[PDB]
Amino acid sequence: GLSDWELAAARAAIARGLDEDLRYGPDVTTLATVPASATTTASLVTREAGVVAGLDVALLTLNEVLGTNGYRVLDRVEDGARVPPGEALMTLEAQTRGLLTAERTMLNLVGHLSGIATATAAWVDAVRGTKAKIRDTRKTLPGLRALQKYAVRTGGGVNHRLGLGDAALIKDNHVAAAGSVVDALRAVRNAAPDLPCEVEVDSLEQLDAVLPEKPELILLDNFAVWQTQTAVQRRDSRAPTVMLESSGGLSLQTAATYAETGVDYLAVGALTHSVRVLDIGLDM
């Protein structure tokens, strides 16, 4: 379900996409070969297996090109469906010219979003049987954040930060300016008491230092599995309320290893930067 916020991001995205395509003129070739009165039944069918996402975004692209009632949906799959290869995600009847113009933007969008959801479902499978939840980052493509965040949620992950003012995140730079990790922490505690504290540590010594300050979340930046295990042992005994999120040296191969240490979350930048498209085509 696209929130009004997401729905707005989608429209803006679909508009930017159509504008890139039409900027150089209309599809001279459909115009030349296919009549304005032509109508077809087309299907978005997967060329591979995965988790579908962004189907509503496909519909919104048609609204923009054909008008809300310019097409008919004979059938569709729900976003989040695990889908086998030749699956028909959505079947529609629409003026042929409109379909052909909307095609590329619509496939680009849903192929991208399904790619993310597919990847996140893999991560979510990898740590099944563990308490860890898979979470995203702000390492998103400019202009697509709302959509990419939507896709990880669709694949079963949980959204983390939406931007700079979401929560207070004390990093290396801040600790420095404050003097120390506890310094930065206290400062922020007073500046934005209403805001969730998250502190990024890159060593076990920094971990020990902030643990007593009891921030909401500690990010273990590039810890080996063994240091992660230690981190959890320490948190469990000293500051039970602090959440721990692994961030950094994560691969889908190691994901379960990290998950079994008992960390609460896995921060996966790859879900949004580095995405592999889910291959989909429009079959007429």
Which residues here bind ligand NCN, judged by CB under 6 A? 137-139, 160-161, 169, 219, 221, 247-248, 250, 267-270
Identify the active-site residue in 11, 133, 145, 171: 171
Q: How far is the CB of 72 from ligand NCN (least distance, A)?
A: 26
Helix, strand, coil share (%) of the chain residues, nearest 5: 45, 20, 35
Site membership for its own copies, residue 192 (CB under 8 A):
yes
Which single residue is written with the structure tokens 């976003």?
79
| Count of chain residues binding its own copies (CB under 8 A) | 72
Residue 28 within binding range of its own copies, rule CB under 8 A:
yes
C-beta closer to its own copies: residue 233 or 251: 251
Annotated active-site residue in 6, 198, 200, 264: 200
Tokens representing 60 are 């919104």
Least CB distance to its own copies at residue 228 (A): 20
Q: What is the CA radius of gyration of the chain?
A: 23
Q: Which option in ligand NCN, its own copies, none does residue 87 bind, with CB closer than 5 to 8 A by kind?
A: none
Rounded to whole angstroms, the Cα distance separating 235 from 221 reads 16
221 in catalytic set: yes
Q: Which of 198, 213, 221, 245 is catalytic?
A: 221
Judge whether 219 and 172 are in contact, CB under 8 Å. Answer: no
According to the binding rule CB under 8 A, does residue 114 interact with its own copies? no
- Consult the annotation and say whether 131 binds a ligand: no
- Does 279 participate in catalysis according to the annotation? no
For residue 248, the partner it binds in its own copies, ligand NCN, none, with Cβ less than 5 to 8 A by kind, is ligand NCN
| Cβ at position 232, least distance to its own copies in Å | 25
133-155 exposure pattern, b = at least 16 Cβ within 10 A, e = fewer: bbbbbeebeeebbbbbbbbbbbb
How many residues would you count in the chain?
A: 284
Tell which one of 133, 138, 214, 234 touches its own copies (CB under 8 A): 138
Q: Say if CB 268 and CB 250 are below 8 A apart.
A: yes
Under 8 Å between Cβ of 73 and 41: no
Stretch that binds its own copies, among 66-74, 78-86, 250-258, 272-280 (CB under 8 A): 272-280
For 252-264, give the DSSP string.
Answer: TTTHHHHHHTT-S
Residues 6+ apart with CB under 8 A from 268: 120, 123, 134, 135, 136, 137, 157, 250
Give 163-191 as a DSSP string. STTSSEEE-HHHHHHHSSHHHHHHHHHHH
Q: Minimal distance in Å, beta carbon 24 to its own copies?
A: 4
- Residue 214: active-site member: no
Among 11, 21, 88, 130, interactor with its own copies by CB under 8 A: 21
Active site residue 21: no
Any known ligand binding at 171? yes
Say whether 171 is catalytic.
yes
**Least Å from the CB of residue 276 to ligand NCN:** 11
Using rule CB under 8 A, residue 108 touches its own copies: yes
Residue 70 marked ligand-binding: no
Backbone phi, then psi, for 147, in 5-degree steps?
Answer: -75, -50
State the binding site for substrate: 104, 137-139, 161, 171, 200, 221, 247-249, 268-270
Return the active site residues.
Answer: 104, 139, 171, 200, 221
